[PDB]
Design a protein around this ligand. Structure first.
Ligand SMILES: *[C@@H]1O[C@H](CO)[C@@H](O)[C@H](O)[C@H]1NC(C)=O
Ligand SMILES: [Mg+2]
Length: 119
């Protein structure tokens, strides 16, 4: 079942470049998905569990989103930190908050993200 905003072929789900946000992302994706394209949306973080509910995912394309590296990014960060190679994710960059702006997502630590939600 291909989520409404996206185009699917095989086990590729193309949801790129569609103005998606956390609020508007599909709540689930075909459980057999192996490649998910989210490049070039409006995402600042990913809902908890979205990528972990995709147990066959090989690669996710996540670049060109305005990622905010705070505590809402703890789930994406965990997923990235668990990948077998982080180099394919080196185009993922934090735009905010100022203390993490310019950092690459795959090398963030969890504690940094907790700290980035300070009052
Ligand atoms: C996505 O962000 C762009 C760039 O700021 C904005 O113009 C556009 O309205 C947003 N699209 C949606 C669907 O929110
Ligand atoms: Mg968002």
């Amino acid at each position: 079942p291909c989520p409404a905003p996206c185009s699917c072929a095989g086990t590729l789900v193309d949801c790129g470049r569609r103005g998606l946000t956390w609020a508007s992302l599909p709540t689930a994706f075909p459980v057999d998905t192996t490649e998910l394209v989210l490049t070039g949306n409006n995402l600042t973080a990913l809902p908890p569990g979205l990528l972990d509910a995709l147990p066959a995912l090989r690669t996710a394309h996540l670049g060109a989103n305005p990622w905010r590296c705070d505590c809402r990014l703890v789930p994406l960060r965990a997923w990235l930190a668990g990948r077998p190679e982080r180099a394919p994710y080196r185009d993922l960059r934090c735009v905010a908050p100022p203390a993490l702006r310019g950092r690459l997502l795959p090398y963030l630590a969890e504690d940094e993200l907790r700290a980035a939600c300070a009052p």
